[PDB]
Design a protein around this nucleic acid. Structure first.
Ligand code: ZN
Ligand code: ZN
Lengths: 147, 57, 134, 69, 49, 444, 286, 65, 57, 196, 112, 89
RNA sequence: AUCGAGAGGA
DNA sequence: TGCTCCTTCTCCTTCCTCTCGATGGCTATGAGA
DNA sequence: TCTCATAGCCCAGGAGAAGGAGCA
């Protein structure tokens, strides 16, 4: 495919191939938004699933004729917080920390992660433990002695 | 410490009458922990001990 | 111009014989550019076996010298006026030089076979059996 | 350091042989194990007392502040 | 946050900087306190007690 | 035919009778080879030491009194020049300080059992010129007690016998190497820096951290002088078409477009720049358009610069009030001095062709790194590192302190002239009073 | 930067390195590591390079990866091809090891950077300046001693033992492979039988041993000093103990050791001493 | 001569004013005052491509047979 | 073997009632200064985890 | 810590299979014809192409690691409980390191048979710029031991190159146990201040 | 494949210069040649002018005693060569417009 | 997870269960359906030829074969036409 | 005794 | 008239022991020989 | 009457804020 452009003499030189390469890495043909790519995983004590890097839900709600839309799991919290309310992000937190400690085969009781996930939700949404999460709590000296 | 990295702390100076005695007549100077050898993998201490007994004879 | 007193005045320049063999670009002249080391004697040789064009070795006084050809920038038929160095030939002894030309052109000229003489020493082979002792 | 008095583990007094041990090396011009056998140290726990020793204490006797150099 | 007579760069401690870090006050003298009637040693095994 | 020996008899014979000719264990004295070599290279060498080579680099100091004499603006007068012709260090010689008796030898046991330093006196040859050598003086000024290195060219235990090394209250293998100050042995630890005079092509985030249009592609080079001083020179590739240049000076840096440096080294044409950078690679239109950007942007941004002299006086105007030669020097010589002191200081004079070649080569390798036809590099490997020794840095710091003290002398003269004191610098007691007021305590 | 890189084979000690905070940084050299403190007289090097058939850079007007750039330690000389470049590199090493030309020192670092896809920019570099880390190896076509620096180490073959020298695989070999260790690393017996963090712990515990500081201890006024009375030579010792003169400074002493769990005290690095050994001078400290 | 979109003087080699930005029949030099060419030059043009680096794809890895 | 320069006679320190740093009336830092040893915040977490608040006060 | 002559016979015989392991693994990942020596110029160019890319190098080193660990676990499960010079309630080393006293059977395998591969951050040893791992290797050798497959053991003596790569593994381990001391404690303090 | 050596001229006959590619030097300018005797070779010195510019140059002292070039003239039917010793004149051009400069200051004081 | 509470995950992922009637070829067809496709994935060569009529330049793009990205990314050449038409230029 | 700098240990 | 996305600044963090140092300079007064 | 010789003092690591540069 060959085409032609015309310009005036304002710049009179610029790096044209570099401009075209900067553009061609940002031109999408079929971008399902906020989804990069799916692969073919293997089931480990479960049915057949598909791992998709990139997170979205409306386009996957759309594809119900192919995909079981009732066991959609992920790793991010904020998309689960916007989509499936407040408790599903809590279950995702518990499942992700369970995954991490299963990667080292170090058993941790679920009551402690239960307590962490319910402590991170005591003000409605997904609360941090940095200065921003301590900021909402109403203890003066506890905020003082940290940062 | 020895010459194989296996440092240590003298916990008790053991009396010579309480020492294990050999058939030749002698008793050792330092008794060392035998369980330190699998984890640390210091097999050269065997070699230094054997060569030193050879040089001592 | 009084440029410094360490400089003196040249006075002799013998003329360059262009038209001893020159005709209209068909005489197959071999006018060369030669890159010699300044270590050897010049006017006591008798021949110059540089016609092999790749392996024209000439060992001079117990040391090897490979005379390679240059199809590079001094003799390439790729770029116009690719000859950096310009053949400056005189008209008489004291007078200034002028640029030599293949015809009525006022343009530089390249040279027909350009060389490069590298000092090749022996660097002998390894005694294999002496060094692989068990 | 001077050669010690007894053995480290045994207690068989062994430094008394020392210079005579040196007399077996300097004057007698003998091998090491032969001279150690002629001294009669049949246990090797004294053979590590004599052979391993170095007379550094002579080197401390060239910096005498009482002696006029 | 001030100006400065530069090229030596020696800030003498304002009362803000004496309150902010481990070298401040809440960790150096409020929480981390060197105590009285304490001891410190190297240890040794004893399978008889 | 045994494998290993004790050598008890040879050990005892070497203990009781140390050798009176040569030190025992000649392999031991390769361990402290770098410190003692880097301290002995200060005084002797292929040119007679390198510190005296180094003091012939700082040039001269020029001051003017103000001189209302009878126009005294362009003919002000009293061109006082302060410079140094020669610096050498004496071996340690001490005495009773009163009446200056003949000084006996100094041994390191005299500093061990005094809990103080071990110092030899520092002396310099101060050239005191007045108005282009019209009144030339050669004042000798002692500096004070400078520490030396043990068993080196300025300590007496260097080549004495091991027998006397026992007799002079030292170990039989007292190799030393350390310095002694305040009764404490301390030395200067070696360092690892970038290998000198080698154009290193790197990519780092801190290059782009400086500002906009700053690519990661950079040639770092560490230009040294023959006194083992150095100067960092950084070449950034831009996203514009220019190539920027970093160089440090007195805890400050600058940014210079590189074609200013190119036409400041030598008057030339742009075809020479083309022939130097890309060569026979003319089909590669990438770097061709980069050089086209460079030349058109240079001769479009400032077309009023058309030789070397205009650009050098432009540099001398732009760089007048920081190099501190402002009340006297013409801007042409100021620019030539800065190009002598910043760009490619491994040549000095008669370097302009080779400096020009080196700069075009660094531009070629920089744009080659942009196009990705060479791998990135790393200062972590031993391929591109070098060792900074103790004595070389010691001589550098002493050069620095001497130059600082001469500048402090010039500052004292500038403070004195504005009061209305003695105008003429020929006077001996005036100069003696000025040197009395100044502090020359270099040893402390 | 803390990680060990494989270009340090011969120059820095892979074993002798502290732990804790300076771990990975604070390296140590080998006993065959000379730090050159001299400008070697390499002024005749460009002249013999022009003898070797190199056109001058003034008369060249070229710069590119196809043309090998011939430099001396920060100063461009000329432009050649790469085949003749490596011929000149190895022939110049041949003229380095053999004393044929008097204006050429033994310690000229000849780095031939070959044309390789995604490597460093090519060229033949010659280093003859100060502060160059130098080390000797054995050179095979003349079978002598060869000074090699690290910038030419990657692009050239350095073997380990003579019996595995293979056909056109190496041009260099070590005198002894134990040259790759430091001074204190060689004083650990049978280092190649141990897990290397224990060798690092050994080469760091060796620098804290209360032993022999000297024999001039009646003339010094040191702040704190430590003397061990009883000093002994190890029977199990390396040859560098005899060579580099640790004989003047006995650090410790030999002992008879039964590897046994007899006491019940020796668990997790403990060790037990006979009491009469203590009572008869088991390293009395001062 | 002209090299791509780059041309200089045949004597001094200085950079010149753009022939597609002049009004006269020639090109005046920035330092000397000479006329080269007579404006009947072969027109200013280049031919440039990509570098086979900036375009990643698994399809590109399919070409690695 | 070889004897390390670390010993037990140096590294032990103890205190009953020593010098107090009268800037804050807090026990001073230093072994030769007769200084006590330091509690960390992680050790405060360890004492809250047992709940032993009387010993914590 | 000794075997019988048949134990060392098995050790040498199965380590004779480690000659072309990296060769055939590189032939696998390169996707060319198998049974090709370590000097093929198209193979060496493609190995340079693999080496200059990071993830391609990771794939090659994962395949090499899988094959050499297959050989390793083969030798371990063959020789280590079976062909000892003295059996289990006389072999005090196995009597220690089986009941959970010190370490595992991995240490017994590294003493008695071979160390294996020194996995610096889960892969093969890093390379110099010219396609050489050590100065004693010709460029792009297809030996697994050139990638660090330590065939030697802590009893019969290890090669110097094996010792050098083991020093790399030890320095990596010391860096890893130094970096994780002041790391997790900050997170622990940050989520003790919240939950007190 | 052998080529005979006929005549080796010892006197300076042809010396080769070098300016740049595309340089042709019309008839207005001349190639002024000066001598220097350092007692082993001759640094030929090139000078020249035209209506607006001026070129000067020489042969460098680090190369001409380490290099030598030969002008060759061969005839195959004669099978003969003339061989001239030749240094290469390296010379650069400046302009007559390059005689412009600023004064040694810009009249600054402590207020400036 | 617990301290920072960040939304910019390093590798955010999603695990979608599939039904039992869907075969592996059908699920991989869905995987080629869901996937994000960049333009430079189907670009072999970009050739820019400037000529200065004022300053201008002609762009020639050599793509790959149509069946390749048709089978791999489910893209026709007229979808390529429309995406050059809409967003690229 | 404050700040730097250095060293060393679990 | 009012309401968003693109640039800067502006923020913050394992335990112990020991040693060793730690402002320059511009003016007074004040005898010595 | 100057020369000393001193007193008395002047390169992570993103997350927020916060406000300009365009848009219904
Ligand atoms: Zn005994
Ligand atoms: Zn012109």
């Amino acid at each position: 495919c060959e085409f032609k452009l015309e310009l005036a003499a304002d710049t009179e030189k610029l790096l044209m191939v570099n401009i075209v390469e900067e553009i061609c890495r940002k031109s999408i043909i079929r971008q399902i938004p906020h989804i990069d790519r799916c692969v073919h995983p293997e089931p480990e004590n479960g049915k057949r699933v598909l791992v998709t890097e990139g997170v979205n839900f409306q386009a996957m709600w759309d594809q119900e004729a192919f995909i079981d839309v009732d066991g959609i799991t992920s790793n991010d919290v904020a998309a689960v917080l916007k989509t499936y309310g407040v408790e599903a992000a809590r279950n995702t937190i518990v499942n992700e920390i369970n995954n991490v400690f299963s990667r080292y085969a170090i058993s941790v009781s679920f009551r402690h992660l239960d307590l962490i996930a319910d402590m991170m939700t005591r003000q409605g949404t997904y609360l941090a433990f940095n200065r921003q999460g301590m900021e909402t709590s109403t203890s003066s000296f506890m905020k003082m002695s940290y940062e | 410490s020895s010459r194989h990295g296996q440092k240590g702390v003298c916990s008790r100076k053991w009396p010579t009458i309480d020492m294990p005695f050999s058939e030749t007549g002698i008793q050792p100077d330092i008794i060392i922990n035998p369980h330190a050898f699998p984890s640390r993998m210091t097999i050269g201490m065997f070699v230094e001990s054997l060569a030193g007994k050879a040089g001592a004879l | 111009f009084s440029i410094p007193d360490g400089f003196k005045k040249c006075k002799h320049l013998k003329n360059f014989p262009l038209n001893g063999d020159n005709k209209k670009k068909a005489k197959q002249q071999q006018v060369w550019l030669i890159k010699f080391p300044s270590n050897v004697d010049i006017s006591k040789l008798k021949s110059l076996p540089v016609d092999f064009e790749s392996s024209t070795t000439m060992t001079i006084d117990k040391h090897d010298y490979k005379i390679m050809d240059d199809t590079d920038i001094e003799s390439s038929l790729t770029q116009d006026n690719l000859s950096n160095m310009t053949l400056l030939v005189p008209s008489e002894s004291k007078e200034s030089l002028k640029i030599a030309s293949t015809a009525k052109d006022n343009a530089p000229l390249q040279f027909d076979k350009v060389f490069s003489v590298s000092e090749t020493a022996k660097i002998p082979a390894i005694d294999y059996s002496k060094v692989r002792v068990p | 350091m001077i050669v010690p008095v007894r053995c480290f583990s045994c207690g068989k007094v062994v430094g008394d042989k020392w210079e005579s041990y040196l007399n077996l090396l300097q004057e007698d011009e003998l091998d090491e194990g032969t001279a150690l056998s002629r001294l009669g140290l049949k246990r090797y726990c004294c053979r590590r007392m004599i052979l391993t020793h170095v007379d550094l204490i002579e080197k401390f006797l060239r910096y005498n502040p009482l002696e006029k150099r | 946050k001030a100006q400065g007579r530069t090229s030596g760069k020696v800030p003498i401690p304002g009362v803000k900087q004496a309150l902010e870090k481990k070298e401040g006050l809440f960790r150096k003298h409020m929480m981390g306190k060197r105590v009285n009637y304490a001891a410190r040693s190297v240890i040794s095994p004893d399978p008889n007690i | 035919a045994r494998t290993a020996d004790f050598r008890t008899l040879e050990r005892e014979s070497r203990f009781i009778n140390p050798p009176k000719d040569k030190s025992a264990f000649p392999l031991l004295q390769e361990a402290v080879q770098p410190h003692i070599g880097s301290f002995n290279a200060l005084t002797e060498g292929p040119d007679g030491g390198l510190l005296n080579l180094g003091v012939k680099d700082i040039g001269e100091k020029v001051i003017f009194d103000g001189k209302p004499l009878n126009s005294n603006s362009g003919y002000l007068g009293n061109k006082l020049s302060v410079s140094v012709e020669q610096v050498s260090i004496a071996k340690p010689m001490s005495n009773d300080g009163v009446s200056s008796a003949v000084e006996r030898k100094v041994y390191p046991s005299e500093s061990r059992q005094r809990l103080t330093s071990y110092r030899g006196k520092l002396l310099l040859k101060l050239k005191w010129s007045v108005n282009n050598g019209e009144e030339n003086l050669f004042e000798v000024r002692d500096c004070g007690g400078l520490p030396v290195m043990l068993q080196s060219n300025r300590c007496h235990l260097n080549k004495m016998s091991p027998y006397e090394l026992v007799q002079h209250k030292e170990e039989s293998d007292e190799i030393g190497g350390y310095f002694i100050v305040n009764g404490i042995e301390k030395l200067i630890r070696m360092l690892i820096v970038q290998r000198r005079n080698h154009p290193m092509a790197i990519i780092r985030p801190s290059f782009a951290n400086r500002g906009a249009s700053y690519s990661h592609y950079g040639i770092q080079i560490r230009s040294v002088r023959p006194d083992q001083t150095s100067q960092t020179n950084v070449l950034h590739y831009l996203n514009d078409g220019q190539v920027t240049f970093r160089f440090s000076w007195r805890k400050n840096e600058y940014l210079v477009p590189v074609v200013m440096i190119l036409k400041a080294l030598c008057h030339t044409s742009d075809r020479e720049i083309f022939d130097g950078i890309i060569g026979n690679d003319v089909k590669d239109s990438f770097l061709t358009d980069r050089l086209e950007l460079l030349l058109r942007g240079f001769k479009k941004r400032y077309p009023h610069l058309q030789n070397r002299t205009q650009v050098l006086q432009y540099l001398g105007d732009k760089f007048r009030v920081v190099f501190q030669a402002s009340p006297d020097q013409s801007d042409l010589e100021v620019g030539q001095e800065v190009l002598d002191r910043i760009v490619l200081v491994h040549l000095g004079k008669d370097g302009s062709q080779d400096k020009f070649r080196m700069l075009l080569f660094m531009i070629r390798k920089l744009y080659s790194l942009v196009a990705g036809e060479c791998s990135p590099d790393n200062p972590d490997a031993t391929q591109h590192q070098e060792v900074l020794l103790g004595g070389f840095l010691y001589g550098m710091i002493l050069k620095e302190k001497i130059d600082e003290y001469l500048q402090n002398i010039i500052a004292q003269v500038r403070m004195d002239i504005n009061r209305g004191m003695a105008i003429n610098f020929k006077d001996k007691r005036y100069m003696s009073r000025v040197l009395m007021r100044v502090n020359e305590n270099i040893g402390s | 930067v803390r990680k060990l890189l494989p270009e340090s084979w011969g120059f820095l000690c892979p074993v002798h390195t502290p732990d804790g905070s300076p771990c990975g940084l604070l390296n140590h050299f080998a006993h065959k590591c000379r730090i050159s403190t001299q400008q070697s007289d390499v002024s005749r090097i460009p002249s013999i390079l022009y003898s070797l058939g190199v056109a001058p850079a003034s008369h060249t007007f070229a710069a590119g990866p196809s043309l090998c750039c011939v430099q001396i330690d920060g100063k461009i000389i000329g432009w050649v091809s790469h085949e003749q470049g490596k011929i000149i590199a190895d022939t110049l090493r041949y003229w380095k090891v053999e004393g044929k030309t008097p204006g050429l020192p033994i310690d000229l670092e000849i780095g031939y950077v070959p044309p390789s896809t995604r490597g460093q920019y090519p060229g033949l570099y010659l280093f003859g300046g100060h502060s160059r880390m130098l080390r000797p190896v054995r050179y095979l076509p003349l079978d002598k001693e060869d000074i090699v620096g690290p910038f030419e180490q990657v692009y050239m073959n350095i073997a380990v033992t003579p019996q595995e020298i293979q056909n056109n695989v190496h041009t260099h070999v070590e005198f002894t492979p134990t040259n790759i260790l430091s001074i204190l690393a060689n004083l650990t017996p049978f280092s190649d039988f141990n897990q290397s963090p224990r060798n690092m712990y050994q080469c760091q515990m060796g620098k804290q041993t209360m032993g022999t500081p000297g024999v001039a201890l009646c003339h010094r006024s040191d702040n704190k000093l430590y003397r061990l009375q009883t000093g002994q030579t190890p029977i199990v010792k390396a040859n560098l103990y005899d060579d580099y003169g640790m004989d003047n400074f006995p650090n410790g002493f030999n002992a008879v050791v039964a590897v046994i769990s007899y006491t019940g005290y020796d668990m997790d690095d403990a060790m037990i001493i006979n009491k009469s050994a203590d009572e008869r001078g088991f390293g009395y400290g001062t | 001569s002209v090299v791509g979109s780059l041309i200089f003087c045949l004597d001094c080699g200085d950079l010149l004013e753009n022939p597609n930005a002049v009004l006269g029949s020639n090109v005046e030099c920035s330092q000397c005052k000479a006329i080269y060419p007579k404006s009947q030059f072969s027109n200013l043009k280049v031919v440039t491509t990509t570098a086979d680096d900036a375009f990643p794809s698994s399809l590109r890895a399919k070409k690695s047979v | 073997y070889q004897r390390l320069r670390h010993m037990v006679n140096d590294k032990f320190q103890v205190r009953s009632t020593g010098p107090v740093n009268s800037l804050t009336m807090q026990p001073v830092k230093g072994r030769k200064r007769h200084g006590g040893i330091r509690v960390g915040e992680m050790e405060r977490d360890a004492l809250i985890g047992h709940g032993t608040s009387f010993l914590l006060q | 810590l000794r075997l019988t002559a048949e134990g060392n016979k098995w050790r040498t015989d199965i380590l004779k299979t480690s000659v072309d392991t990296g060769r055939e693994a590189a032939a696998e990942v390169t996707n060319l014809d198998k049974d090709t020596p370590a000097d093929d110029p198209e193979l060496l160019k493609r190995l340079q192409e693999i080496l200059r890319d990071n993830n391609k190098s990771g794939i090659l080193d994962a395949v090499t690691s899988s094959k050499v660990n297959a050989i390793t676990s083969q030798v371990v499960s063959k020789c280590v409980p079976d062909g000892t010079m003295k059996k289990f309630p006389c072999n005090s080393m196995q009597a220690m390191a089986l009941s959970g006293a010190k370490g595992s059977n991995v240490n017994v395998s590294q003493i008695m048979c071979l160390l294996g591969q020194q996995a610096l951050e889960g892969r093969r040893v890093p390379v110099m710029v010219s396609g050489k791992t050590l100065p004693s290797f010709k460029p792009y050798e297809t030996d697994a031991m050139a990638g660090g497959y330590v065939k030697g053991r802590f009893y019969s003596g290890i090669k110097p190159q094996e010792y050098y790569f083991h020093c790399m593994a030890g320095r990596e381990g010391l860096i890893d146990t130094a970096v994780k001391t002041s790391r997790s404690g900050y997170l622990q303090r940050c989520l003790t201040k919240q939950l007190e | 494949s052998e080529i005979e050596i006929e005549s080796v001229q010892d006197q300076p006959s042809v010396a080769v210069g070098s300016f740049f590619k595309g340089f042709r030097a019309p008839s207005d300018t001349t190639f002024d040649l000066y001598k220097k005797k350092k007692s082993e070779k001759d640094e030929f010195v090139l000078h020249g002018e035209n209506e607006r510019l001026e070129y000067e140059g020489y042969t460098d002292s680090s190369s001409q005693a380490s290099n030598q070039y030969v002008v060759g003239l061969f005839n195959p039917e004669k099978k003969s060569i003339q061989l001239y010793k030749a240094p290469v004149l390296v010379s650069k051009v400046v302009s007559k417009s390059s005689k412009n400069l600023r004064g040694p200051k810009i009249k600054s004081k402590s207020d400036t | 997870i617990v301290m920072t509470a960040s939304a910019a995950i390093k590798t955010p992922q999603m695990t979608l269960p599939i039904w039992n009637d869907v075969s592996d070829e059908q699920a991989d067809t869905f995987c080629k359906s869901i996937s994000k496709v960049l333009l430079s994935e189907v670009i072999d060569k970009v050739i820019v030829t400037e000529t200065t009529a004022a300053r201008s330049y002609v762009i020639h793009m050599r793509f790959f074969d149509n069946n390749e990205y048709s089978e791999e990314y489910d893209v026709s050449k007229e979808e390529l036409q429309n995406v050059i038409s809409n967003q690229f230029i």
